[PDB]
Amino acid sequence: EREIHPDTTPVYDRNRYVSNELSNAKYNAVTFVPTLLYEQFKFFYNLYFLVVALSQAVPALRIGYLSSYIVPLAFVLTVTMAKEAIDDIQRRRRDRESNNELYHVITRNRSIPSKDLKVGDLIKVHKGDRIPADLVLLQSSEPSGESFIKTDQLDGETDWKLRVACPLTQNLINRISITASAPEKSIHKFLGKVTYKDSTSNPLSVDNTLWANTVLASSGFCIACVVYTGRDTRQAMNTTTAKVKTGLLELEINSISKILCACVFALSILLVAFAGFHNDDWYIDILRYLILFSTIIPVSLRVNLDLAKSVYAHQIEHDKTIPETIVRTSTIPEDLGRIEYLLSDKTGTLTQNDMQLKKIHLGTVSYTSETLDIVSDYVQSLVKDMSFRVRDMILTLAICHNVTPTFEDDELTYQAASPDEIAIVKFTESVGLSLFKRDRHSISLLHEHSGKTLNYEILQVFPFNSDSKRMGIIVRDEQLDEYWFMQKGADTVMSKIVESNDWLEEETGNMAREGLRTLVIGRKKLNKKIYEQFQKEITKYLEHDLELLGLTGVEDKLQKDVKSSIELLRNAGIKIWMLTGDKVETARCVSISAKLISRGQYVHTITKVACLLIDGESLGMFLKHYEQEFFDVVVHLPTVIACRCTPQQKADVALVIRKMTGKRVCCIGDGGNDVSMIQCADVGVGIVGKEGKQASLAADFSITQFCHLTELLLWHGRNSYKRSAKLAQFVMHRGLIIAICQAVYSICSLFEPIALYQGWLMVGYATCYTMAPVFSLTLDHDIEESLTKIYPELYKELTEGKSLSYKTFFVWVLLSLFQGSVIQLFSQAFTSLLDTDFTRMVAISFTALVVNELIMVALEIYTWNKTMLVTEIATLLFYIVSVPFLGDYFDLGYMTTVNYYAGLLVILLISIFPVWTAKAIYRRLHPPS
Ligand code: ALF
Numbered sequence: 001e002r003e004i005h006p007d008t009t010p011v012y013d014r015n016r017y018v019s020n021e022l023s024n025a026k027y028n029a030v031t032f033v034p035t036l037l038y039e040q041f042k043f044f045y046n047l048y049f050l051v052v053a054l055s056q057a058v059p060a061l062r063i064g065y066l067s068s069y070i071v072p073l074a075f076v077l078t079v080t081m082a083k084e085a086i087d088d089i090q091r092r093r094r095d096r097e098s099n100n101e102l103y104h105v106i107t108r109n110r111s112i113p114s115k116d117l118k119v120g121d122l123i124k125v126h127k128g129d130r131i132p133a134d135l136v137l138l139q140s141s142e143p144s145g146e147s148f149i150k151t152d153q154l155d156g157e158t159d160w161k162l163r164v165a166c167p168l169t170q171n172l173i174n175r176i177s178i179t180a181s182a183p184e185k186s187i188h189k190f191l192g193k194v195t196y197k198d199s200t201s202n203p204l205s206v207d208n209t210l211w212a213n214t215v216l217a218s219s220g221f222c223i224a225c226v227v228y229t230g231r232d233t234r235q236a237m238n239t240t241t242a243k244v245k246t247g248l249l250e251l252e253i254n255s256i257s258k259i260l261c262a263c264v265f266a267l268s269i270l271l272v273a274f275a276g277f278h279n280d281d282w283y284i285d286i287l288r289y290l291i292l293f294s295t296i297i298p299v300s301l302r303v304n305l306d307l308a309k310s311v312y313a314h315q316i317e318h319d320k321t322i323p324e325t326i327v328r329t330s331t332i333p334e335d336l337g338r339i340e341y342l343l344s345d346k347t348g349t350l351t352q353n354d355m356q357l358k359k360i361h362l363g364t365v366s367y368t369s370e371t372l373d374i375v376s377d378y379v380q381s382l383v384k385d386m387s388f389r390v391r392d393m394i395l396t397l398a399i400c401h402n403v404t405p406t407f408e409d410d411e412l413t414y415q416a417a418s419p420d421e422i423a424i425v426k427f428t429e430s431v432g433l434s435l436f437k438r439d440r441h442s443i444s445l446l447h448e449h450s451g452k453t454l455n456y457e458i459l460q461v462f463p464f465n466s467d468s469k470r471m472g473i474i475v476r477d478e479q480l481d482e483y484w485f486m487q488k489g490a491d492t493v494m495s496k497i498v499e500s501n502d503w504l505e506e507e508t509g510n511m512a513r514e515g516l517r518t519l520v521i522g523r524k525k526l527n528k529k530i531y532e533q534f535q536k537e538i539t540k541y542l543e544h545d546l547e548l549l550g551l552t553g554v555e556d557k558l559q560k561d562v563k564s565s566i567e568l569l570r571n572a573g574i575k576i577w578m579l580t581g582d583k584v585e586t587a588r589c590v591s592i593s594a595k596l597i598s599r600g601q602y603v604h605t606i607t608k609v610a611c612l613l614i615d616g617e618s619l620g621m622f623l624k625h626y627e628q629e630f631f632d633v634v635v636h637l638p639t640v641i642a643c644r645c646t647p648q649q650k651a652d653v654a655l656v657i658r659k660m661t662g663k664r665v666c667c668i669g670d671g672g673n674d675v676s677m678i679q680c681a682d683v684g685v686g687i688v689g690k691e692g693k694q695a696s697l698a699a700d701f702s703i704t705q706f707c708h709l710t711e712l713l714l715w716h717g718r719n720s721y722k723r724s725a726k727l728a729q730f731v732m733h734r735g736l737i738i739a740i741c742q743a744v745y746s747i748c749s750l751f752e753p754i755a756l757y758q759g760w761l762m763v764g765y766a767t768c769y770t771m772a773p774v775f776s777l778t779l780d781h782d783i784e785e786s787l788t789k790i791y792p793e794l795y796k797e798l799t800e801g802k803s804l805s806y807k808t809f810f811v812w813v814l815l816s817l818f819q820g821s822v823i824q825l826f827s828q829a830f831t832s833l834l835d836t837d838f839t840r841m842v843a844i845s846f847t848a849l850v851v852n853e854l855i856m857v858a859l860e861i862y863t864w865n866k867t868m869l870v871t872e873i874a875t876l877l878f879y880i881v882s883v884p885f886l887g888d889y890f891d892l893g894y895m896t897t898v899n900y901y902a903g904l905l906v907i908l909l910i911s912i913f914p915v916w917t918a919k920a921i922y923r924r925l926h927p928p929s
């Protein structure tokens, strides 16, 4: 229940109803810190360095500088708050750029923005303008009182919906009371009542209402009253609340961080047990050693990950090959690189929503958009037999339809609830015989060409019906006075009823193999007496025997490079589905034309109360009851195609895919009917370029068309995941190698592992001397963007998870064991460990560590930019010139010795030769392609 008086401004303006302001931002000022801190310190690899930093509050676990465990905690906090604060303010900016659209109010007498709009203000909404909210039509410009709303972004439909004005109020200006029902999720239902003076209640239904993101057509203006606004709209109530999205690589790093924590705890317990359980405080010893060993990985890993994600977002949204792309969730730029299931969409996403009669065929010959001059000079002769057949074909095309034309200064406009008829009439005017003035209530039609304006008053029309697949007319010519029966329809229905032709089925199948929506057309000459016998009066008499004029091939235009995009996304192992709110037949035609369904490849179909093609109710019931069995059936099919899908159904399909397989689900679309599919995905991609952009606003990414998703997945996300995995590898390697050097020094000399690197040296290793070459790895790629099309199978090589797994983590751990043991033990061997050779020993150990990391960085580079050859030399020279001036106390030594440099050469060659030879033999055994 909801009662609306158009004139009582204060009662709705001040309160009682939601404002039209829509919000995409997640965190407000009051709950920006608690929510972000809570959802950031749920995982282990964050809570771990938080506990490491909080350990030093107790004045017994102090390992070193307080300027080393609290300033990187403040740095990770600063970076996190900055990133999500920038994300929220950018979301607010993007959302307010579409909350300021100007709409004219009857009472306010001035154009006001959409957010200023409330419930119950009469908007004079015009033709090409996007509908503001859930409107109810109280008056229409046309005397009939009907207009064609356009819901390609309310649901996935491609036809125009005939919405009539309220018949009691379309003549009226006076104030008219509305009383609607409470808002629901029913996108195809409406229950309201229009109340006038003297208690005259009237019915309202879906046929006299406009909704949130519809676009008007078939008028010049119309007066409509807002009923549902803001979050009470049918659009915003078919949407589930968005949740935070943690990447898969985040989970992998969390798991390997858990195992790393277990490893360093075991190493610390081993160190203390080997010491001898002395000092009367063994628990303090194991805790202090654990803090020592686990304070260089868990916090450097986070800063490296966060700044790498920022770099990935900047690289994505600054690509010339993908213009005008926007990253709206910067926390997951690497889920794009491991996507196994793609949930695409048809209307706007795949198609241009612009159908056009591509091909006409008759008498075993065909005309196309190419060579339209021949058919033009054929029709211009209206005022051997092939010319007459073509002329009568064109006449039947231009008369049999249900298209309403209306006039401007020029560029006459067509208005039909079936846009294939609009494509037909546009084709006829392009050939030369144009539709003009049509009554459509009385009996009249006007048609002018290069000659004289004809006229054909209709005699009867049989409306198009969903169970009939036919549109038939009886028409009377003015000039020649001839009764004609003209019918167009589907192949399956008119094939048995048109004639005894010999060539229908072949050409119908031939063009249906190209995804053309074919309609066959037949003609029957009539005289008067049979017509008055007909008018004496079920459907048997009206269709007896026709003559096949020909058939029409109407294509649904696809977006730029859709078939190639689908071919390469399936060549990379991504199983493209296609869920749509449109009709079954148009979905099948788009699937065949886009080669989502290839040659042959029999298609099954389900409609309940190889390939697949299922209705919405059938899929909903199947996922409600038969989850596991049906889903295990469908995962082996190449493509599953769904039709008539509620947004909840697409969201549930994405949820079921990411739950029953544990794979990552991308979901591309546009318009608000696939917002839930986008928010409940693991990656949400939106598309812009038309009147509606509301799915791109709520999405995680945004691209201008469908061709851009190929390079958004195959090159940007794949590189993002690869670079993040290699970054985690190198950070954990440097932390583990310093931990191993300290542990080897502790076993070889019973003092402490803490007493090896004290003061400046440990801080400099953690931050100054090592952090730049990892971000050097952040800017590396194996194959260029120009060759991400030729090699889609590279996207298949990341399918297993052979980059961040337990096996490769333990390979890193074993490499760290080997190299740290070599560094520490050869340092002890060359420096002859005592209490006076400690400085030289720690000097050679630290220099070996630094150069070892800088060589291991330079070993794992595919292509060398100039932003990586300089950030290694910069750090190496910083270490070289940072020994005397900033150190001088720690690790002091002579270092101007020929034997020292040979010892360093040996201690580094033994550490970097296994890695180099392993990658050499692995490159000579498994060449890449
Ligand atoms: F664009 Al659709 F269902 F194909 F919303």
Ligand SMILES: [Mg+2]
Binding pocket: 152, 153, 155, 156, 345, 347, 348, 669, 670, 671, 672, 673, 674
């Ligand atoms: Mg849509």
